[PDB]
Amino acid sequence: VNSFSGYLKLTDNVYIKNADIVEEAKKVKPTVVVNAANVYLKHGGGVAGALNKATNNAMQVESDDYIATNGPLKVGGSCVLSGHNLAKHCLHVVGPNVNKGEDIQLLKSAYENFNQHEVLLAPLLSAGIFGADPIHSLRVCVDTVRTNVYLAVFDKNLYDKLVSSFL
């Protein structure tokens, strides 16, 4: 039993809610919040920009030190950093960005990172300004992630469409 509230059950292990991941994180303080990162950990817009703003830019400062030491991530890859005031840890996951012409096949690899964590609060990967098909991303999520995932979807119209079309 955990403290996630008002999520709709999609599968054995995947739940979904129309909610601001910033607010869900502040309320639940999950062990892991997932960021929809890019390979440079430049948290400019979308989920990444919103989470970073909620940390008062501490996420970006930490991220810049990470990149200076380790270099960029891979598309489909991830790293674990602090969750700051939002969570114990932040799992920065790089899903493919279609508006950069990135390989949508890499979305499954991106979701595989979630399997290293028993429970996660996460956004739907590669949706919103990443420009991939969100129905496809949800199918990939449910077919790839085996651990317990609580998906927070900011856009109300998107959430309604995802629920109504889910097989």
Binding site for ligand QRU (CB under 6 A): 20-22, 36, 46-47, 50, 123-130, 153-155, 158
Residue partners of 106: CB distance under 8 A and separation at least 6: 75, 76, 95, 96
Structure tokens at 160: 């309604």
Question: What minimum distance in Å lies between the beta carbon of 151 and ligand QRU?
Answer: 9
Cβ proximity to ligand QRU: between 65 and 156 the closer is 156
Q: How far apart are CA 68 and CA 123, in angstroms?
A: 26
Cβ proximity to ligand QRU: between 81 and 130 the closer is 130
Question: What minimum distance in Å lies between the beta carbon of 81 and ligand QRU?
Answer: 18
Question: What minimum distance in Å lies between the beta carbon of 65 and ligand QRU?
Answer: 23
Cβ proximity to ligand QRU: between 135 and 158 the closer is 158
Question: What length is written for the chain?
Answer: 167
Cβ proximity to ligand QRU: between 65 and 143 the closer is 143
Q: How far apart are CA 27 and CA 21, in angstroms?
A: 10
Q: Which amino acid is at 79?
A: C
**Which residue do the tokens 């995802």 mark?**
162
